[PDB]
């Protein structure tokens, strides 16, 4: 039987993994709030980071 | 031990992978890794 020699070990891992411009990287998405513009969203996100 | 002996073990004891998953409120994907991964293990 397989459990004579195989032991079952729990672990937690990523499903996918992304590299962007030669670096490991997380993908971040979002929208401007209602009434705000694509540039305001971009400015906000860049301030946050 | 002949040379071909070492060839045969190093070939056979360095397998690839094999992956399935369990399916009930959850799902987990289970892997089995045959590839060696450091000189000490060779």
UniProtKB/TrEMBL annotation, chain A:
It comes from the Bacteria. It is found in: Cell inner membrane. Belongs to the resistance-nodulation-cell division (RND) (TC 2.A.6) family. This is CmeB. The chain holds residues 794 to 842 of 1040 of the full protein.
């Amino acid at each position: 039987p397989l459990d004579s020699f195989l032991t079952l070990q729990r672990s937690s891992g990523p499903d996918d993994v992304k590299r962007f411009n030669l670096f490991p990287a997380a993908q971040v998405q979002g929208q401007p709030a209602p009434g705000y513009t694509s540039g305001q969203a971009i400015e906000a996100i860049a301030q946050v980071a | 031990i002949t040379a071909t002996d070492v060839i045969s073990a190093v070939n056979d004891q360095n397998a690839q992978y094999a992956t399935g998953k369990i399916g009930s409120p959850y799902v987990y994907s289970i892997t089995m890794q045959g590839r060696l991964q450091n000189p000490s293990e060779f």
